[PDB]
Write an enzyme that holds these catalytic residues in place. Sequence first.
Site, PDB file in Angstrom:
ATOM      1  N   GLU A  32       0.786  -1.164  -0.183  1.00  0.00           N
ATOM      2  CA  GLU A  32       0.181  -0.052   0.037  1.00  0.00           C
ATOM      3  C   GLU A  32       0.867   1.376  -0.010  1.00  0.00           C
ATOM      4  O   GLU A  32       1.817   1.321   0.594  1.00  0.00           O
ATOM      5  CB  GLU A  32      -0.820   0.036   1.258  1.00  0.00           C
ATOM      6  CG  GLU A  32      -1.724  -1.051   1.403  1.00  0.00           C
ATOM      7  CD  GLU A  32      -2.818  -1.074   2.483  1.00  0.00           C
ATOM      8  OE1 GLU A  32      -2.275  -0.641   3.650  1.00  0.00           O
ATOM      9  OE2 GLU A  32      -3.911  -1.659   2.455  1.00  0.00           O
ATOM     10  N   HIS A  40       3.959   0.554   2.433  1.00  0.00           N
ATOM     11  CA  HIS A  40       4.046  -0.629   3.498  1.00  0.00           C
ATOM     12  C   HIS A  40       3.594  -1.866   2.954  1.00  0.00           C
ATOM     13  O   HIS A  40       2.518  -1.836   2.372  1.00  0.00           O
ATOM     14  CB  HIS A  40       3.753  -0.271   4.763  1.00  0.00           C
ATOM     15  CG  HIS A  40       2.118   0.144   4.656  1.00  0.00           C
ATOM     16  ND1 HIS A  40       2.031   1.761   4.692  1.00  0.00           N
ATOM     17  CD2 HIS A  40       0.960  -0.270   4.786  1.00  0.00           C
ATOM     18  CE1 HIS A  40       0.650   1.990   4.621  1.00  0.00           C
ATOM     19  NE2 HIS A  40       0.026   0.666   4.625  1.00  0.00           N
ATOM     20  N   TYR A  78      -9.291  -6.179   5.248  1.00  0.00           N
ATOM     21  CA  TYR A  78      -8.412  -5.038   5.584  1.00  0.00           C
ATOM     22  C   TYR A  78      -7.013  -5.119   4.797  1.00  0.00           C
ATOM     23  O   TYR A  78      -6.410  -4.182   4.491  1.00  0.00           O
ATOM     24  CB  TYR A  78      -8.309  -4.791   6.966  1.00  0.00           C
ATOM     25  CG  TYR A  78      -7.491  -3.429   7.385  1.00  0.00           C
ATOM     26  CD1 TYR A  78      -8.339  -2.168   7.368  1.00  0.00           C
ATOM     27  CD2 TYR A  78      -6.431  -3.108   7.687  1.00  0.00           C
ATOM     28  CE1 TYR A  78      -7.814  -0.967   7.289  1.00  0.00           C
ATOM     29  CE2 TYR A  78      -5.757  -1.977   8.174  1.00  0.00           C
ATOM     30  CZ  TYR A  78      -6.794  -0.764   8.112  1.00  0.00           C
ATOM     31  OH  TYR A  78      -6.103   0.415   8.237  1.00  0.00           O
ATOM     32  N   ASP A  83      -8.151   0.114  -1.527  1.00  0.00           N
ATOM     33  CA  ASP A  83      -8.109   1.509  -1.069  1.00  0.00           C
ATOM     34  C   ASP A  83      -6.551   1.723  -0.536  1.00  0.00           C
ATOM     35  O   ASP A  83      -6.019   0.904   0.454  1.00  0.00           O
ATOM     36  CB  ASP A  83      -8.831   1.861   0.169  1.00  0.00           C
ATOM     37  CG  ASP A  83      -8.893   3.164   0.578  1.00  0.00           C
ATOM     38  OD1 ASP A  83      -8.248   4.076  -0.198  1.00  0.00           O
ATOM     39  OD2 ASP A  83      -9.253   3.637   1.565  1.00  0.00           O
TER      40      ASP A  83
END
Length: 95
Positions: A32, A40, A78, A83
């Site tokens: 991300e 990361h 997650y 995103d």
Amino acid sequence: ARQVICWCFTLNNPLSPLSLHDSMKYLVYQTEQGEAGNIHFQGYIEMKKRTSLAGMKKLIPGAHFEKRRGTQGEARAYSMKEDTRLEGPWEYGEL
């Protein structure tokens, strides 16, 4: 408990891809975009056996670990979310 199976982590500016070590049952992670130019890995691990924070820190040097919040499905989501994603996700092992 102090030792648990399920852990989330981030690894800032990683140097190479992760591996499923023999102590790990399941791993999912992705890369991300962070702020200030950082990137990361964001991931979720289920160990084969209950493991302490100190054991997880030895497992992935440099990573920031936290005991899994929420459900398995939430933690996986997650670590697989679109995103901010740059690359991945990659899934290893068995849920």
